[PDB]
Amino acid sequence: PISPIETVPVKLKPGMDGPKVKQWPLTEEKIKALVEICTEMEKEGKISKIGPENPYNTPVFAIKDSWRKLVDFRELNKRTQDFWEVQLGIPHPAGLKKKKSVTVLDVGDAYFSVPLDEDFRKYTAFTIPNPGIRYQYNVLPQGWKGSPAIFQSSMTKILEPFAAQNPDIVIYQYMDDLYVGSDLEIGQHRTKIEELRQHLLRWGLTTPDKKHQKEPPFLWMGYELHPDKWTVQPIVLPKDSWTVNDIQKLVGKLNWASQIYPGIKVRQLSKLLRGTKALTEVIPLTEEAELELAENREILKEPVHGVYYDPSKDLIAEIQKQGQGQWTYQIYQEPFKNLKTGKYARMHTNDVKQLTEAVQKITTESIVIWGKTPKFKLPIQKETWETWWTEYWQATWIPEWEFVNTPPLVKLWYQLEKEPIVGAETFYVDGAANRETKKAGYVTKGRQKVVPLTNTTNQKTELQAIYLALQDSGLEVNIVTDSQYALGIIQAQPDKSESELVNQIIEQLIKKEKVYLAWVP
Amino acid sequence: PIETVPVKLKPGMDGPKVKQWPLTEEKIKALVEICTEMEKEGKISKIGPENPYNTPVFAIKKKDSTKWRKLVDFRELNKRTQDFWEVQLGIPHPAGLKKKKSVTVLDVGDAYFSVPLDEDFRKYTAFTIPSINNETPGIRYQYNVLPQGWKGSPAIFQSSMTKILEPFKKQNPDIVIYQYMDDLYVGSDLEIGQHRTKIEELRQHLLRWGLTTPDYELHPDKWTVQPIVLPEKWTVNDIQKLVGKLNWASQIYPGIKVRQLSKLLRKALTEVIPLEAELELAENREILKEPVHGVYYDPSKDLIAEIQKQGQGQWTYQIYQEPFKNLKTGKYARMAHTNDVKQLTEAVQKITTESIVIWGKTPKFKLPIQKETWETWWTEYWQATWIPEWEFVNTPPLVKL
Ligand SMILES: CN(C)C(=O)CCOc1ccccc1Oc1cccc2cc(C#N)ccc12
């Protein structure tokens, strides 16, 4: 129905006017179809025939499981005012508050049921064809710019009276859907829903009847929402010849399945497409990737489920290291049943850093989803955290955290000293490199000079000369350098890196009993 | 019903469409209670989908109470109104305020919730209270009176301010008063007790003439471009380190002659050594406190502030507009409960107040923190009604100060 709701006043972008696109008559059997629809639409108030009162025009169309009208409004859309955004995100099943009964009422003829502002109707005119019959829209036209936002506003207002009288029942508004939950007996609940239908009916809004109410499991935005548990719809990943396109679709499904399937790891499969490359360009299958996907098919061989949220119970997140710069986390309120899961990654950095980064990802998500931060049970001890940050240049803060001993625990693999020692050496280590052609040294023993190389970078050489300082190094020792590059790297106390030379320096630093470094101009 | 000053954006400019940050449930209920009272009082009215604009809203904890405050982020609207709206009706920045021995800071923002806001400008104050987990579309409002945090608010109210302040400003000719946003900066060369009485007279004088005040003492006499120096002690390590920072110094001031002190070994020597070099360091230390000339403030250029984590509850900062060009240098410190984040918050709010007094603008900050961590907890200690620009640093070189 046309609806007794008030209309949102519309304007055109300042100093613009209605679209004057003309139509190309195309098929004329379709014109017989289009006259059929437009006669019904005039019969229910949706459109009204108009004279040639200098109106504007927009195209038509007839595209049809095998017709259906489709005005192109692109030209009007470009001249209509801007509206509030509609709904950027989607509610997460982990955030859903548990309810005794749930009901999916699918409104019918949504946009067509909400009147359109009178003074803006002229601009929705569309002509139907060797003269031509005229027509304008009386309700919210499909594909018009302000249809989605004005329906959402209208539905929000139509519900205010009924919510008022029903503070117990919770209604979610999504697109053309209402998801409606309660904590009362089914017979009670079936009565309340039936009141919602009649309320909506009076306003022009049709809904499914009891036999036609969708029944669970609800397949919705890529999940299965069961009555008391939720999961992802069955993720499906196949051959041997793959594409960039095939790799991308696959990493999509494993990120997707990773919100409830713990331990998914997609790193290997991701690095493969790390370059611009192409879309059809077939890509080789690395063996470590064929492992990840092999492990991944094992996680997905058996099903797992999330539970819904209870805001009375408290929120607990746990992190556990996976190796290779990958971490995996699980939020729950009771230890068995996870609200949801997920994973973290990094783009060469100490573990405590990458750990405190993971806590960041979780806090952000916790606030977006439950409006509360999750209490944390991490595999680390104050001794390890307090010292890392306190001599970390960067600011960091982590919410309540209790220790859990679930190796692999994260720890400080080594540690530099703050003041010099009871006597070791110098190791003034340089890395002379000719940017025109393919150094190393220490003046403690003065046994400097080990080996240059081709394509060796002065930055690699200086860092290698510090590793070269580690060569003659014994126990408690002290090195020095004029290369700022080197200092920042070992000072960051990294625990793994891409150049194993730097990983060797960690093995040296991990081995040596007391180290102290310094820089000079 | 006062006549509404009309507000025009610099033509060719649209209104803010900033996205609202997700908030915690504690803060949303707070904003819902605040916003409901504000809608009863007429200060704000709910709006429709044909308003496209948005600016972000946060909740903070005011001075120290349970009482939650609502804080609007008009950074975007400020850049699109106050620029040429200040040029229209701007507050002249008083030069002497940097000179006085004490400067106190009076919140005067609640007064703005009286003067009605021009009807055609209201749509651009749209803001949104968020919901949680996308459960509902947010709650939407605009303003009908001068909003706090819009730099056009003091610009419009400045005429009312001058009338109430006319008598206090004659009986007290020595006092420098500056308005910036929701704050009234008062400086006097009086004694601390005397200064505090004069402030209390001012608050009283303001209270009785309607302008509701709450009912932060700065000492800019002790602010300068603090020179880089080192306390006296010298081992090789101490010598080499001291040798180092002098090289970074030759930059901010070409005149150092480290080679004179550089005379040293050329074997294990991290032990001890006796120091002419004594004379050389003495002359340099004189040149060190020398005020670096060639340092000029251009109003066209923006103000950049950088902060560095020193350690043990203390922080150092440098405000410049160009490479080097160090217009101010200083230190911040705390006792306690301070964390990496909370101190930085208090630091920033001390580095902003300083640029406001000195140059009447806030500085755009480079911050030593992961962006998302800042974005999550900055409001948990923010207590200013304004918000500076900020970007996040990544690679901290050992600047050596
Ligand atoms: C979801 N469920 C069975 C629960 O048991 C969890 C409780 O979910 C609700 C709580 C209040 C209102 C409505 C609730 O239900 C929903 C919330 C959000 C999206 C929904 C999408 C569909 C579809 N297609 C069906 C129901 C939905």
Q: Which residues are CB-neighbours of A280 under 8 A, at least 6 positions away? A: A243, A244, A245
Residue B171: burial class (beta carbons within 10 Å; 0-12, 13-18, 19+): exposed
The answer to whether A156 faces chain B, any CB pair under 8 Å, is yes
- Report the nearest atom of ligand 1 relative to the CA of A104: 25
When CB atoms are compared, the residue of A364, A397, A519 closest to B341 is: A397
Residue A106, SS3?
strand
Name the nearest CA neighbour of A262 among A226, A228, A306, A224.
A306
CA atoms within 13 A on the CB side of B278: 5
The answer as to CATH 3.40.50.2300 being correct for domain A310-403 is: no
Tell me the C-alpha distance between A418 and A517, whole Å.
Answer: 9
Give the H or E element holding residue A150: helix A147-165
Q: DSSP labels for A19-77? A: -B-------SHHHHHHHHHHHHHHHTTSEE----SS--B----------------HHHH
How would you list the strands of the sheet with B102-107, edge to edge?
B102-107, B183-188, B176-180
Tell me the C-alpha distance between A325 and B204, whole Å.
Answer: 62
Tell me the C-alpha distance between A505 and A488, whole Å.
Answer: 13
Are the C-beta atoms of residues A505 and A490 closer than 8 Å to each other?
yes
Q: Which residues are CB-neighbours of A121 under 8 A, at least 6 positions away? A: A136, A137, A138
Give the H or E element holding residue A157: helix A147-165
Contacts of A398 in chain B (CB under 8 A): none
- Give CA A237 to chain center in angstroms: 21
Tell me the C-alpha distance between B101 and B97, whole Å.
Answer: 9
Give the H or E element holding residue A465: helix A458-472
Mutation site, B13, B239, B270, interface A, largest A CB count within 10 A: B270
- Give CA B360 to chain center in angstroms: 10
Secondary structure E strands in A380-424: 401-403
The answer to whether B134 faces chain A, any CB pair under 8 Å, is yes
- Strand A282-283 relative to strand A242-243: parallel, antiparallel, unpaired? antiparallel
Tell me the C-alpha distance between B191 and B83, whole Å.
Answer: 38
The answer to whether B251 faces chain A, any CB pair under 8 Å, is no
Secondary structure E strands in A417-512: 477-478
Q: Which residues are CB-neighbours of A137 under 8 A, at least 6 positions away? A: A46, A47, A116, A121, A124, A126, A144
Give the H or E element holding residue A320: strand A316-323
Q: Which residues are CB-neighbours of A276 under 8 A, at least 6 positions away? A: none
Q: Which residues are CB-neighbours of B119 under 8 A, at least 6 positions away? A: B4
Alpha-carbon Rg for chain B, nearest whole angstrom, is 25
Tell me the C-alpha distance between A514 and A419, whole Å.
Answer: 11
Contacts of A482 in chain B (CB under 8 A): none
For residue A95, give the amino acid letter: G
Length of chain B: 401
Are the C-beta atoms of residues A313 and A334 closer than 8 Å to each other?
yes
Centre of ligand 1 to C-alpha B131, Å, is 17
Feature table: binding site of B: 107, 182-183
Mutation site, A397, A421, A425, interface B, largest B CB count within 10 A: A397
Question: What are the extents of the domains in chain A?
Answer: 29-85+111-147, 93-109+148-216, 230-299, 310-403, 414-521
Tell me the C-alpha distance between A120 and A11, whole Å.
Answer: 7
Kindly compute the dihedral angle of the four CA atoms of residues A163, A165, A168, A169, in this order, to the nearest 10 degrees. Answer: -40
The number of beta carbons lying within 10 Å of the beta carbon of residue A438 is 10
In angstroms, the separation between the Cα of residue B235 and the nearest Cα of chain A is: 11
Name the nearest CA neighbour of A361 among B376, B2, B235, B206.
B376
Exposure string of A314-336, with b = 16+ CB inside 10 Å and e = fewer, is ebbbbbbbeeebbbbbbbbbeee
Centre of ligand 1 to C-alpha A92, Å, is 10
Contact (CB<8Å) B268/A423: yes
Are the C-beta atoms of residues A428 and A482 closer than 8 Å to each other?
yes
For ligand 1, say whether the CB of A308 is within 6 Å of any of its atoms.
yes
Contacts of A516 in chain B (CB under 8 A): 270
Tell me the C-alpha distance between A153 and B279, whole Å.
Answer: 80
Closest residue in B to A516 (Cα–Cα): B270
Are the C-beta atoms of residues A230 and A339 closer than 8 Å to each other?
no
Centre of ligand 1 to C-alpha A179, Å, is 6
Contacts of B48 in chain A (CB under 8 A): 8, 153
Domains A29-85+111-147 and A414-521 share a fold: no
CA atoms within 13 A on the CB side of B170: 5
Centre of ligand 1 to C-alpha A172, Å, is 8
Centre of ligand 1 to C-alpha A319, Å, is 28
Tell me the C-alpha distance between A397 and A376, whole Å.
Answer: 13
Are the C-beta atoms of residues B176 and B94 closer than 8 Å to each other?
yes
Tell me the C-alpha distance between A290 and A256, whole Å.
Answer: 19
Please measure the distance between the N-terminal and C-terminal CA atoms of chain A and give it in whole angstroms. Answer: 82
- Give CA A293 to chain center in angstroms: 22
Residue A322 tokens, joined = 């996976």
Feature table: binding site of A for Mg(2+): 106, 176-177, 430, 462, 482
Contact (CB<8Å) A87/B247: no
Alpha-carbon Rg for chain A, nearest whole angstrom, is 33
Please measure the distance between the N-terminal and C-terminal CA atoms of chain B and give it in whole angstroms. Answer: 57
For ligand 1, say whether the CB of A193 is within 6 Å of any of its atoms.
no
The number of beta carbons lying within 10 Å of the beta carbon of residue A165 is 10
CATH for A230-299, among 2.102.10.10, 3.30.70.270, 3.40.190.10, 3.40.50.2300?
Answer: 3.30.70.270
Tell me the C-alpha distance between A251 and A274, whole Å.
Answer: 12
When CB atoms are compared, the residue of A10, A370, A393 closest to B309 is: A393
CA distances in angstroms from A445 to A421, A480, B73, B257, listed in the order given: 18, 15, 63, 31
Which phi and psi angles does B364 have, rounded to 5°?
-80, 120
Residue A479 tokens, joined = 């090195």
For residue A59, give the amino acid letter: P
Sign of CA dihedral B118, B120, B121, B127: positive
CA distances in angstroms from A61 to A30, A33, A111, A137, listed in the order given: 9, 11, 19, 16
A414-521 topology per CATH: Nucleotidyltransferase; domain 5 (3.30.420)
- Give CA B364 to chain center in angstroms: 9
- Report the nearest atom of ligand 1 relative to the CA of A219: 24
Feature table: binding site of A: 106, 176-177, 430, 462, 482
When CB atoms are compared, the residue of A9, A420, A519 closest to B50 is: A9
CA angle A349, A327, B20 (to 5 degrees): 90
CA distances in angstroms from A288 to A269, A271, A292, A294, A324, listed in the order given: 9, 11, 6, 10, 12
Tell me the C-alpha distance between B175 and B100, whole Å.
Answer: 9
Name the nearest CA neighbour of B146 among B211, B203, B204, B208.
B211
- The structure's method of determination equals X-ray
Name the nearest CA neighbour of A39 among A110, A125, A111, A128.
A128
Contacts of A364 in chain B (CB under 8 A): 372, 376
Closest residue in B to A488 (Cα–Cα): B397
When CB atoms are compared, the residue of B22, B52, B340 closest to A84 is: B52
For ligand 1, say whether the CB of A227 is within 6 Å of any of its atoms.
yes
DSSP A96: P
For ligand 1, say whether the CB of A217 is within 6 Å of any of its atoms.
no
Closest residue in A to B375 (Cα–Cα): A364
Helix axes A458-472, A484-491, angle to 10 degrees: 60
Contact (CB<8Å) B341/A425: no
Residue A47 tokens, joined = 């459109």
Sign of CA dihedral A309, A313, A315, A320: negative
Contacts of A389 in chain B (CB under 8 A): 340
Contacts of B341 in chain A (CB under 8 A): 395-397
The number of beta carbons lying within 10 Å of the beta carbon of residue A121 is 21
The answer to whether A8 faces chain B, any CB pair under 8 Å, is yes
Contacts of B52 in chain A (CB under 8 A): 81-84
Are the C-beta atoms of residues B360 and B383 closer than 8 Å to each other?
no
Centre of ligand 1 to C-alpha A6, Å, is 30
When CB atoms are compared, the residue of B25, B243, B267 closest to A520 is: B243
Contact (CB<8Å) B23/A371: yes
Domains defined along chain B, listed by start: 6-95+121-161 (3.10.10.10), 96-120+162-217 (3.30.70.270), 218-297 (3.30.70.270), 298-401 (3.30.70.270)
Residue A339, SS3?
strand
Q: What is the resolution of this structure in A?
A: 2.7
Are the C-beta atoms of residues B367 and B393 closer than 8 Å to each other?
yes
Q: Which of residues 277-316 of B touch A (CB under 8 A)?
A: 308-309, 311
- Strand A515-516 relative to strand B44-46: parallel, antiparallel, unpaired? unpaired
Q: Which residues are CB-neighbours of A298 under 8 A, at least 6 positions away? A: none
CATH architecture of the domain formed by A29-85+111-147: Roll (3.10)
The answer to whether B63 faces chain A, any CB pair under 8 Å, is no
Helix axes A382-390, A351-369, angle to 10 degrees: 100
Residue B117: burial class (beta carbons within 10 Å; 0-12, 13-18, 19+): buried
Name the nearest CA neighbour of B260 among B250, B270, B269, B268.
B250
When CB atoms are compared, the residue of B22, B52, B136 closest to A368 is: B22
For A293-302, the CB contacts below 8 A with 24+ separation are A293/A237, A293/A250, A293/A269, A295/A263, A295/A265, A296/A237, A296/A254, A296/A264, A296/A265, A296/A266, A297/A237, A299/A257, A299/A261, A299/A262, A299/A263, A299/A264, A300/A235, A300/A237, A300/A257, A300/A261
When CB atoms are compared, the residue of A92, A156, A360 closest to B137 is: A156
Last residue before each break in chain A (C–N > 2.5 Å): 64, 66, 129, 130, 238, 347, 438, 444
Give the H or E element holding residue A289: helix A287-299
Centre of ligand 1 to C-alpha A301, Å, is 27
Residue A94 tokens, joined = 């982990």
Give the H or E element holding residue A197: helix A186-203
For ligand 1, say whether the CB of A196 is within 6 Å of any of its atoms.
no
CA angle B172, B177, B179 (to 5 degrees): 155
Contacts of A146 in chain B (CB under 8 A): 49-50
Q: Going by CA atoms, what residue is nearest to atom 1 of ligand 1?
A: A225
Residue B348: burial class (beta carbons within 10 Å; 0-12, 13-18, 19+): buried
Tell me the C-alpha distance between B31 and B249, whole Å.
Answer: 50
Are the C-beta atoms of residues A360 and B373 closer than 8 Å to each other?
yes
The answer to whether A475 faces chain B, any CB pair under 8 Å, is no
For A401-409, the CB contacts below 8 A with 24+ separation are A401/A359, A401/A376, A401/A377, A402/A375, A402/A376, A402/A377, A402/A378, A403/A377, A403/A378, A403/A379, A404/A318, A404/A377, A404/A378, A404/A379, A405/A379, A406/A320, A406/A379, A407/A379, A408/A321, A408/A323, A408/A379, A409/A379, A409/A380
Contact (CB<8Å) A488/B397: yes
CATH for A93-109+148-216, among 3.40.50.150, 3.40.50.2300, 3.30.70.580, 3.30.70.270?
Answer: 3.30.70.270
